[PDB]
Design a binder for this molecule. Structure first.
Ligand SMILES: CC(C)=CCSP(=O)(O)OP(=O)(O)O
Ligand SMILES: CC(C)=CCSP(=O)(O)OP(=O)(O)O
Ligand SMILES: CC(C)CCOP(=O)(O)OP(=O)(O)O
Ligand SMILES: CC(C)CCOP(=O)(O)OP(=O)(O)O
Ligand SMILES: [Mg+2]
Ligand SMILES: [Mg+2]
Ligand SMILES: [Mg+2]
Ligand SMILES: [Mg+2]
Ligand SMILES: [Mg+2]
Ligand SMILES: [Mg+2]
Lengths: 298, 300
């Protein structure tokens, strides 16, 4: 039952984040309230899911995986807070609630996003991960940083800002999505595998292919749902991309062709999972998620 | 012997070289966002935090080349913090380091992402850069420290209290709290990163180096408050009376100029008292003595 595994992942990840947010100073001040709101209230937690599902393949303990799970979700949550700001996408709705900058003001959203970024790295450097070597811990931190910064998520966000109003062609659009979305999703998978020493790293070339495909599919589905989704189901505004002239898969290719591309990427993702079930790994959660990425309505 | 003004410039040249070396391999060169990081990180600034890193590591025989990593890292964090600080939602400044601020020059969006990227870059340097005499444990401790000094327990927490204190004329203890977090934490991290580069010898010095750093840390910000009142815009690189314009809670606003000055003097008195304990173990404290003094003698 995949919806129960989602649900359980959400609960598990939220307690992980709360564990790491609890010892922080300034509890019940605006800025920290904004971090909790942005990190913990709503969300599918698909990236934590990727961390846990990857790590679980190699038999690493869930409790260990809480660290990298919470960390990728901190980067993710920070990314949404900034992405909603007036200078960026100017959204007032996210996860069925007023966005961070709307409820707490711009200054607090900005700072809460900054602080969440930093918390991702406190967690990866300070958290208990019993069976993870120092060298491996450094590799997780290195990967998360590269995936989140100008070579990954921030760099894609900048390609996205520059492509507003230009209706860039397919190759450039692929480049935007792979960076702004794909990179962090590949970091999730990679953090899961990096928790698992030699066997985890032996799976990386293939898990990489898997991650690059679901990562891109995830963003084209995000683009598709922006066009055809209900504001009430999505938790954020239908038509937000059209309204700003964002370059997207549906705007360029139309809906049918964009759905077709997302399906091609999941077919390919499934091929890469087929190679892992040959290294004796149980890919069942990673397959269910890959389907879910393009079948979901939120 | 020792000629502070040329050490300061050599440190700027060395830190800029280090920053540059870590930015060059990055993708999207000559695009608005990397232009914004380069502008905000490299064009001007005193590089006092890198000075702290270098000077501290040098006391323990640590190689300058190794120290380029933590030093560029603390300066990456510092630079990001300024870009976000000047934003219209924050301090709404149009002028820094003699030039238009990143948001005026590049747009708000580009300034937010440049800042975001510079923070991340800080952690990519500490995780990736070569640091041959530094152990894994010490590199993790460098990351953990920069992290807790940069976020809500340090610089960001400090910026949020600063923002909350606008128009609220907070008393001395709450003002000290603001300054120790928003400014102190990162200067202390520069010192800690220098010491952690030296492994065990550096760790044994931390209790004391912390006392030093805690005092120059606070001093830094009270002198920054004083300079906001009495400084020439053209010398500061930033607008005189910006604090007074936003109702910021500052040392001079609360205590007046004489008393803020005296508090800065007293904190450097204390900072140099701590450094005497380190010179007693035959560590050369002269560069940190000199910097402590420059922190309240400076006019920018
Ligand atoms: C926020 C980041 C880095 C990426 C996602 S793209 P987006 O602006 O389309 O995201 P939403 O549709 O706003 O959820
Ligand atoms: C920029 C950070 C984190 C702290 C310093 S306080 P400030 O806003 O007074 O600094 P400036 O005077 O704007 O340089
Ligand atoms: C497309 C994207 C990177 C922005 C939102 O991603 P998401 O649909 O996983 O958002 P949630 O965390 O709210 O589920
Ligand atoms: C007061 C403060 C922490 C912000 C500016 O610090 P600073 O005077 O070192 O600024 P520079 O990097 O421009 O020298
Ligand atoms: Mg958005
Ligand atoms: Mg966006
Ligand atoms: Mg979208
Ligand atoms: Mg300020
Ligand atoms: Mg300011
Ligand atoms: Mg100031």
């Amino acid at each position: 039952d995949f919806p129960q595994q989602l649900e359980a992942c959400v609960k598990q990840a939220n307690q992980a984040l709360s564990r790491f947010i609890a010892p922080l100073p300034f509890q019940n001040t605006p800025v920290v309230e904004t971090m909790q709101y942005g990190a913990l209230l709503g969300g599918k937690r698909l990236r934590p899911f990727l961390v846990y599902a990857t790590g679980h393949m190699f038999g690493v303990s869930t409790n260990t995986l809480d660290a990298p799970a919470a960390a990728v979700e901190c980067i993710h949550a920070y990314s949404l807070i900034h992405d909603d700001l007036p200078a960026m996408d100017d959204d007032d709705l996210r996860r069925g609630l007023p966005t961070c900058h709307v409820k707490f003001g711009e200054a607090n959203a900005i700072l809460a996003g900054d602080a969440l970024q930093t918390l991702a790295f406190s967690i990866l450097s300070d958290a208990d991960m019993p069976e993870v070597s120092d060298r491996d811990r450094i590799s997780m931190i290195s990967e998360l940083a590269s995936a989140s910064g100008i070579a990954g998520m921030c760099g894609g966000q900048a390609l996205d800002l520059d492509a507003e109003g230009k209706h860039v062609p397919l190759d450039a659009l692929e480049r935007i999505h792979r960076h702004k979305t794909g990179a962090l999703i590949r970091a999730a998978v990679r953090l899961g595998a990096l928790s698992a020493g030699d066997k985890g790293r032996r799976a990386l070339p293939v898990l990489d292919k898997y991650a690059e495909s679901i990562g891109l599919a995830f963003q084209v589905q995000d683009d598709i749902l922006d066009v055809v989704g209900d504001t009430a189901t999505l938790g954020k505004r239908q038509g937000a991309d059209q309204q700003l002239g964002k370059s997207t898969y549906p705007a360029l290719l139309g809906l049918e062709q964009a759905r077709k591309k997302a399906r091609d990427l999941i077919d390919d993702a499934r091929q890469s999972l087929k190679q892992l079930a040959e290294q004796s790994l149980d890919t069942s959660a990673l397959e269910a998620l890959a389907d879910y990425i393009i079948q979901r309505n939120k």
